[PDB]
Scaffold this active site. Structure first.
Site, PDB file in Angstrom:
ATOM      1  N   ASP A  70     -15.291  -2.703  -2.597  1.00 19.44           N
ATOM      2  CA  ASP A  70     -14.363  -1.800  -3.417  1.00 19.44           C
ATOM      3  C   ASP A  70     -15.082  -1.954  -5.103  1.00 19.44           C
ATOM      4  O   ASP A  70     -15.020  -0.739  -5.671  1.00 19.44           O
ATOM      5  CB  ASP A  70     -13.188  -2.300  -3.581  1.00 19.44           C
ATOM      6  CG  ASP A  70     -12.311  -2.288  -2.196  1.00 19.44           C
ATOM      7  OD1 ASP A  70     -12.640  -1.297  -1.357  1.00 19.44           O
ATOM      8  OD2 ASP A  70     -11.385  -3.171  -2.038  1.00 19.44           O
ATOM      9  N   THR A  78      -5.006   8.003  -5.730  1.00 16.16           N
ATOM     10  CA  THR A  78      -4.426   9.129  -4.969  1.00 16.16           C
ATOM     11  C   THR A  78      -2.833   9.088  -5.036  1.00 16.16           C
ATOM     12  O   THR A  78      -2.056  10.249  -5.090  1.00 16.16           O
ATOM     13  CB  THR A  78      -4.680   9.267  -3.413  1.00 16.16           C
ATOM     14  OG1 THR A  78      -4.358   8.158  -2.671  1.00 16.16           O
ATOM     15  CG2 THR A  78      -6.277   9.548  -3.400  1.00 16.16           C
ATOM     16  N   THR A  79      -2.248   7.866  -5.161  1.00 14.55           N
ATOM     17  CA  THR A  79      -0.863   7.698  -5.314  1.00 14.55           C
ATOM     18  C   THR A  79      -0.239   8.159  -6.735  1.00 14.55           C
ATOM     19  O   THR A  79       0.672   8.199  -6.879  1.00 14.55           O
ATOM     20  CB  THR A  79      -0.412   6.305  -5.011  1.00 14.55           C
ATOM     21  OG1 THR A  79      -1.129   5.397  -5.797  1.00 14.55           O
ATOM     22  CG2 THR A  79      -0.714   5.783  -3.529  1.00 14.55           C
ATOM     23  N   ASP A 100       0.877  -1.206  -0.014  1.00 13.63           N
ATOM     24  CA  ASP A 100      -0.091  -0.093   0.028  1.00 13.63           C
ATOM     25  C   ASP A 100       0.853   1.339   0.117  1.00 13.63           C
ATOM     26  O   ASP A 100       2.052   1.121   0.474  1.00 13.63           O
ATOM     27  CB  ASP A 100      -0.813   0.090   1.255  1.00 13.63           C
ATOM     28  CG  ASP A 100      -1.940   1.136   1.091  1.00 13.63           C
ATOM     29  OD1 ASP A 100      -2.712   1.138   0.228  1.00 13.63           O
ATOM     30  OD2 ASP A 100      -1.746   2.104   1.919  1.00 13.63           O
TER      31      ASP A 100
END
Length: 505
Positions: free
Chosen positions: A369, A76-77, A43
């Site tokens: 998800d 977001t990454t 993560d």
């Protein structure tokens, strides 16, 4: 001396560490502290929650990631990685003694122009197309690892989100509950329109199947009641010990008798039930149960229009609900009740079966998800090609727009386009292929009149169509990424003065 020269190279330490952990593959580089709390988890945002900061510049980029995660939940990454790549290229122009003013505006101009280019590329989709909804679903579960029946799971998940389509076109995740119950295998997976419960009937004499049953909710328990005011029992004559047992016979008779007079074919309860109460319900013949979560007592009344009754004496017919079809049977496991309601489904559920408790928990996280990826498409109704097949197309168009900007500053907006090739480079390096000889093939598919959905597949390892394989991502993730990336870089180019003050509250 200049200080700023040492802060620019500081940002190249966090983006590189969270660069390989993007996509299917990605090795984990855990930098455990002296305590030894190792948490191996591929993560990115989690690494920023437990790590000592070296400079204050690395703390401002964390705020934009948290606000975007809760609103999107993924992607977001992808902004912090491409962001750091832009600063490394800016050094090539900084050596020319360029002013930060003309540089910061060069990125805003290209970013603002991209807001209009990403609209025409986004393809429109309806709320009933059974060809695009099925592809976006199977693409997310493929990464979870469930080759037993992934095709069936994609057909059932699409049938649920496509049936609870409100008038305004939105979707609420609370209207889809999950049930973790072990069974024979995943082949027994089926979605029932209603709500299930493993609490079997306490007595077998009760009816087994009742059509159009009046639902009745009781917030209180079916035991010895007690007045709201303060009261205490007082005994003095031993001859009265027998009257207490007889007094309950009258209270538990007229009270329970009112349930039958009201026309309640089914009953529910939370806490336990009195021992003598089992005799009254035996002669009348009404369905009953015990042990029910308080959260479940609200969805039933909201899904049928019923009202909780704290006092049975104040029972009425308007407060009673309306069950569609109640019946108790088995479906490869323990017997469960099926309180269906197809006459007007307001909130469906979902049941998943597996071979062991450890298997159902894995797939239990994919259904949550999955709703998030498809939940945003029905609301917006716009999608774009996945696999990084969006930045390589805009980079070629920005060159034409940069030509219009005359003067000795066109190179700024052009350098921003060449930095967007990091996305197709990271996925290529992880696959074990050279990212210098393959970047020319992706351009042929977008030369003049080529297709607008070509992308590199990590599985096959060759340029293919994202619509055929099923690769696709939402559009909101792209708008926020370019919007956040356009403003995130401003935190470094705008600043131009080290803060060495003392005492700051």
């Amino acid at each position: 001396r200049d200080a700023q020269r040492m802060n620019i190279l500081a940002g190249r330490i966090i983006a590189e560490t969270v660069r390989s952990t993007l996509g299917p593959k990605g090795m984990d580089k855990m930098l455990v502290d002296d305590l030894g709390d190792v948490v191996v988890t591929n993560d990115g945002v989690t690494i920023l929650r437990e790590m000592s900061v070296e400079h204050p510049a690395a703390k401002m980029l964390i705020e934009v990631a948290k606000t975007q995660e809760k609103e999107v939940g993924d992607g977001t990454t992808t902004a912090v990685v491409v962001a750091g790549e832009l600063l490394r290229k800016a050094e090539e122009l900084l050596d020319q003694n360029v002013h930060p003013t003309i540089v910061v505006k060069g990125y805003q101009a290209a970013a603002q122009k991209a807001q209009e280019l990403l609209k025409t590329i986004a393809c429109e989709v309806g709320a009933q197309d059974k060809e695009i909804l099925t592809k976006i679903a199977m693409t997310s579960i493929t990464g979870k690892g469930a080759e037993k029946a992934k095709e069936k799971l994609a057909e059932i998940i699409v049938e649920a989100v496509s049936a609870v389509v409100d008038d305004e076109g939105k979707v609420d995740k609370d209207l889809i509950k999950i049930e973790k119950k072990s069974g024979a295998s995943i082949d027994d997976t089926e979605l029932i329109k209603g709500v299930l419960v493993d609490k079997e009937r306490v007595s077998a004499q009760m009816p087994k199947k009742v059509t159009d049953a009046k639902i009745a909710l009781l917030n209180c328990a079916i035991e010895i009641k007690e007045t709201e005011t303060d009261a205490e029992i007082r005994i003095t004559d031993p001859a009265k010990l027998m009257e207490f047992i007889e007094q309950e016979e009258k209270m538990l008779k007229d009270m329970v008798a009112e349930i039958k007079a009201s026309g309640a074919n089914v009953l529910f309860c939370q806490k336990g039930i009195d021992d003598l109460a089992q005799h009254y319900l035996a002669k009348e013949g009404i369905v009953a149960a015990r042990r029910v979560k308080k959260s479940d007592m609200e969805k039933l009344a909201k899904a049928t229009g019923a009202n909780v009754i704290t006092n049975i004496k104040d029972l009425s017919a308007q407060d009673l609900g309306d069950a569609g079809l109640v019946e108790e049977r088995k479906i490869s496991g323990d017997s469960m009740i099926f309180v269906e309601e197809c006459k007007h489904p307001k909130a469906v559920t979902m049941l998943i079966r597996g071979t062991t408790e450890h298997v159902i928990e894995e797939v239990a996280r994919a259904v949550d998800d999955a709703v998030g990826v498809v939940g945003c498409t029905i609301e917006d109704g716009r999608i774009v090609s996945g696999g990084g097949s969006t930045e390589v197309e805009l980079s070629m168009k920005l060159r034409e727009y940069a030509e219009g900007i005359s003067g000795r500053e066109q190179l700024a907006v052009r350098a921003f386009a060449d930095a967007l090739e990091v996305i197709p480079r990271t996925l290529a390096e992880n696959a074990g292929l050279d990212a210098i000889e393959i970047l020319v093939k992706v351009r042929a598919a977008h030369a003049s009149n080529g297709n607008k959905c070509a992308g590199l597949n990590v599985f096959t390892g060759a340029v293919e169509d994202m619509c055929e394989n099923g690769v696709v991502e939402p559009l909101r993730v792209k708008t926020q990424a370019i919007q956040s990336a356009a403003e995130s870089t401003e935190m470094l180019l705008r600043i131009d003065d080290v803060i060495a003050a003392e005492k700051l509250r």
